[PDB]
Paper text:
The generic transketolase (EC 2.2.1.1; Tkt) is a ubiquitous enzyme that catalyses the cleavage of a carbon–carbon bond adjacent to a carbonyl group of a ketose sugar and transfers a two-carbon moiety to an aldose sugar. A cofactor, thiamine pyrophosphate (TPP), and a divalent metal ion, Mg2+ by preference, are required for catalysis. More specifically, megaplasmid-encoded transaldolase (LSL_1888, mipB) and transketolase (LSL_1946, tktA) complete the pentose phosphate pathway of L. salivarius UCC118. In this work, we present high-resolution crystal structures of the L. salivarius UCC118 Tkt protein (LsTktA) in the presence and absence of the cofactor TPP and Mg2+ ions, which have been determined as part of a directed structural genomics approach to furthering our understanding of how these bacterial strains colonize and persist in the human gut and enhance the wellbeing of the host.
LsTktA crystallizes in the trigonal space group P3221 with a protomer in the asymmetric unit. Overall, apo-monomer dimerization buries an interface area of 3998 Å2 of each subunit with the formation of 16 salt bridges, 60 hydrogen bonds and numerous hydrophobic interactions predominantly involving residues from the first two domains of each monomer (residues 1–528). Two peaks corresponding to molar masses (MWs) of 138.8 (±0.8) and 70.4 (±2.4) kDa were observed for the apo protein, corresponding closely to the theoretical dimeric and monomeric MWs calculated from the amino-acid sequence of the histidine-tagged Tkt, which consists of 680 amino acids. The peak distribution indicated approximately 75% dimeric and 25% monomeric species in solution. Other changes involve small shifts in the loop 190–198, which is clearly resolved in both structures. This differs from the structure of S. cerevisiae Tkt, where two flexible loops (region 185–198 and 383–393) could not be modelled owing to an absence of electron density in the apo structure. In comparison to the apo structure, 48 of the 54 superpositions had a global r.m.s.d. of less than 2 Å, with the largest r.m.s.d.s (∼7 Å) observed for the human Tkt structures. The two structures are globally very similar, with some slight side-chain rearrangements triggered by cofactor binding.
Author numbering:
A (entry chain A), B (entry chain A): 1 to 662
Write the structure that this text describes.
Amino acid sequence: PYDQVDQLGVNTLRTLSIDAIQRANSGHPGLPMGAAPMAYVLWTRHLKINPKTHMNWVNRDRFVLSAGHGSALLYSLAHLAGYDVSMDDLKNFREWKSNTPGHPEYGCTDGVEATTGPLGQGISMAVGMAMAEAHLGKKFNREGYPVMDHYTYALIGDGDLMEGVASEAASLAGHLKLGKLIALYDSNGISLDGKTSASFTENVGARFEAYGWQYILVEDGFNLEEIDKAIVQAKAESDKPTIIEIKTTIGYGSENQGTHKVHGSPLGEEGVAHAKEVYNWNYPPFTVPEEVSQRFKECLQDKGVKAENKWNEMFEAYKKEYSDLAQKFSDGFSNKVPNTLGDILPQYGEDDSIATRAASQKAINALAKEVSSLWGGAADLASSNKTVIAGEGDFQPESYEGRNIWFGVREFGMACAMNGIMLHGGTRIFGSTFFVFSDYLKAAIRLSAIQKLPVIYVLTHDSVAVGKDGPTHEPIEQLASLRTIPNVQVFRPADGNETSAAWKVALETLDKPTILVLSRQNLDTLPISKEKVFDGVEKGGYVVQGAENEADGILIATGSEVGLALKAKEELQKKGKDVIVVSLPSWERFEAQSEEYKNTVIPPELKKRMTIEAGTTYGWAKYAGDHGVMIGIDEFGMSAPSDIVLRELGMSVENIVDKYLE
Amino acid sequence: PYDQVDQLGVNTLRTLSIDAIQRANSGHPGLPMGAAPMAYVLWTRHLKINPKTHMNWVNRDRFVLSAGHGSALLYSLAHLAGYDVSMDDLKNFREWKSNTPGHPEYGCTDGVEATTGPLGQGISMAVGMAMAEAHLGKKFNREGYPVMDHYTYALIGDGDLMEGVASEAASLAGHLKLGKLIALYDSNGISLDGKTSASFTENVGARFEAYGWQYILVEDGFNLEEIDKAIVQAKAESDKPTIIEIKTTIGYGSENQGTHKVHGSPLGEEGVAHAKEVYNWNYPPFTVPEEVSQRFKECLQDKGVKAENKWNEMFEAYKKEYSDLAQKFSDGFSNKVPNTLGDILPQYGEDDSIATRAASQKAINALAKEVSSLWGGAADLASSNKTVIAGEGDFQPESYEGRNIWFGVREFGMACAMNGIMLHGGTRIFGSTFFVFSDYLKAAIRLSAIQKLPVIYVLTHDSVAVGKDGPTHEPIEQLASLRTIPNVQVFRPADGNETSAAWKVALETLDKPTILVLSRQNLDTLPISKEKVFDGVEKGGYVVQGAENEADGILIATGSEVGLALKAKEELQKKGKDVIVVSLPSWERFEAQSEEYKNTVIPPELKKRMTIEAGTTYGWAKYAGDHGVMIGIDEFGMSAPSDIVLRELGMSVENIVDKYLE
């Protein structure tokens, strides 16, 4: 099974990682040193990948380093395995423009499946990848045609297991019985500040068992043979996901091994030498020994090529027997969308009154028949958010084809799962909760943005118009929270047509997440054509009603406040004041337009402006100008009837009119 | 033990709650109906409180309804118990300005210990309350003087237990062996969307046991006697916190009992009648029966008065035997602070170079001797944040007097615990993590703000200057995230004197949380006096260097960018341009100043302005104006040496100078 060359492999990982860190004079040597043994066994015997085709083989096993600080080990693996990470790349760890950055960045480095610096999120994404494999397998697989059949692995440490979000992900994964998911827990009794037993002395195996996982202990984590065995039993147990606790010694080889001092700093030239002693390692820095290159070739590369070719062959047969199906399987992965979205989506007449959450629910159902790769759910708020895909089944172990995911009351875990689902490929995902609770998943939105994933977030109950549930349930600052996240687009639709148009844009946008911000209360339909609303929303902002002749002023608004501005336009047309009304459903989309376009919507030279949005005024001075007035809410709300809360916080016609006139 | 009158009590809670909800035509009747039995047993036999003194008795048992949607039960209890919640108040549930709002609001209603609409946070705050009781008891208690000796209870449901943050809190509570903490779990198999088994089928008892809690099952949750017994065993087990799982039927009495339909909506007049049938209840709406009033008086009120008086008597003896101690015990609760803070805190000379995280560490240690009620810790980042209180001990079961809390990698649980610590009273708490991970605890900051708690958040590693760790670890949008939260103050100190001044302000501010945003890299000391910096920081913004005569322009900056602006002032004084330099360490504090003061710092009439901050430009147009230029970063950062990242994202002198001149 395992012989002496293999140990020289383990130690090649150790040394590369440590040399990389030492040359950068920056990085985290402890995990590489304690976890090379486990990573070696996995990558050489148990990872079904083919580096020769980079990350394009859709049925490769997926590996995630959730303990993202172990990056130097991941790169050393990617290099040994044959990905486009060269020795020179390892020598540029943490250097400007390198493909070997401080924490792993998906899209930056060949072989890196996920961006994982932030703790907890790596494993919770892996859970999403595993849900996707299960979903797709059940939808597409057939007698003799295992088209979506693979494992999901996550390497995790104590930090991951302390984070709430990894609890939410593990509970959800246990309930969904994701038997193809396996976690390798590098259990070394050390976190950054010191002994883990200063804060974390819980029984991890038992918790995991309480979730419906399988727990396996490997007491000797430098025993390659035992790790292999544990992974084999993890695989045989396909009714349950499995966590393998692997007892290791952090910083193995340093005088400081087993202490916090090896967690987050280079060893220094002395400590690198001392570890090389203990390893009986005599090679110069940044050398791979020949027998190690050859063992990886043997174990990993050649096996990978043959499994991909046997999958390509099996696949060509699939596509001939089950033609229409395999075409959908391909369209899933390539994100094909129909040209008729504009016709498929619901349209609203000038008399319609509908809440944007309900108009979103109607888009979802109209879309589900035509975009067959679309699935999603709510964080135990499908009935409140309105995010049931009617008659399309529930995603459960006995029905992995069901398209309605029941995330439970797990906002952050939901978001991270959606990231994994999208890293996996093959579907379009959406997830809903209340906008005020976007604070709970904000760090995952951040990761959607970094990783450029077109996750769709459906955030309902968007303002103090929520009413009786009171301040904790009434958003104020959450638009500012999400608009500021780079590489996102936030749409706050003003009626049902804007809401349909926002969903179309969300389907057509493939390199950033789209966030839809939706009302609880009914809103009137804007008095202009479908054609113009769709154009305007595709552009992020547009004129809803111009001035007959020369404009006295301009009202710029979003969401539910656009109807308010339309009313204030009427009241003001009396008093002798003819104002423009602009809807600005997305700041980000609006600013990506030409200066020419933007000038047509907000006249650079017109200076009597009012901005109106039920949320903080922070940021609005940009459109309001030195001379403008900002109507907004910069205080917590209250528990009262909707109309009273709005009136009292100044989201009224009378207030907008008075403020424009004073 | 329990007799027929008691059951009529249980049913008074049920009916009041349901009438309250029905009249409001808004609210959540399911939990009240299924959990009155448990709440009755607790409040009448096991809650050591005295309503006659409201919430002023510092050693009362603390009760938290974590399932905040059960508010109508909480108010019915507060009313029956004798708090200032009248029958008329119950008739104004969810009505404007009522003291009976939709979800419970601390500070709004007599008898309400915590604001708990957002799920997970109620129990995690309770954990903090329990840590405070343990801390204070160990510090102050003596032979025959149990001055801080009481229980902490939390009533929780399935939603709480799905949330990550309640896992972080339960793990931490298990590790700290908080034996005075008891949770009552209303386990009814139902969440909002449907059966809990659609998403949540884990073994809660076993997880809780894996944390180091005691688990007790009460299979018949309408058996008053069994609940009582379980609470008695929970109390006898003082080595471990205890969760009591109480199997109930949600909406008991409705045709719809045991379904999701009773979770979040009124029953309707029909269903209220049908529940009253099942209860054999013949009274008119909003009636308390006489024997019930008398049983509460008997069980709860009179016992409460005698326990408080016996504590007052025991206390007067304490204060005479242990005088200096009991004076500190009182100063703790009243938030007394010395007048010499300004002298105690570290001061920096014009040559000093220090990172604001390190200057904060020095303030912490200088403060700890003089403010004896100050304790705190880090989310497994004490060594990175710099939040070790030197030589003041660790907070652990064998040393509950230790003042350094090891929260582990539990940002959100840390924050919520700090809220509970502050609701409890008796200390000043601070907690640290990396600023980029404030996203993880943002919902708890929100609750500090709502509840007006002067929690201190120490957020380090504030910008892309972090460098090699790369984008996931480099804040961009997080200042916008926190500045927009109503009722907070965010300070981004520009040197060590501003950092000392910010800590003083944080101690003196008692009605909102203070957030300190701190640098990783060293910053130079600002070239002006201690006196002027302290004045300026107390004011939120101020002039650092004026123009010799007439100003050509103004540079307004924060944090580390103030030193940059000072350099650009030198380079610009050449080219014939004399500019003002303003430091704006806190927007919120600055805007609370008079218009007169603000005009002296930022001249209303001067229009050549540049704002400079290493983070998003969103919001800055307010100070920059129509004609100004905003220097900021609106993209994710990169993994590279600190100085290169700053240069490339334009946080340089050369860029500020060119931009001011073009």
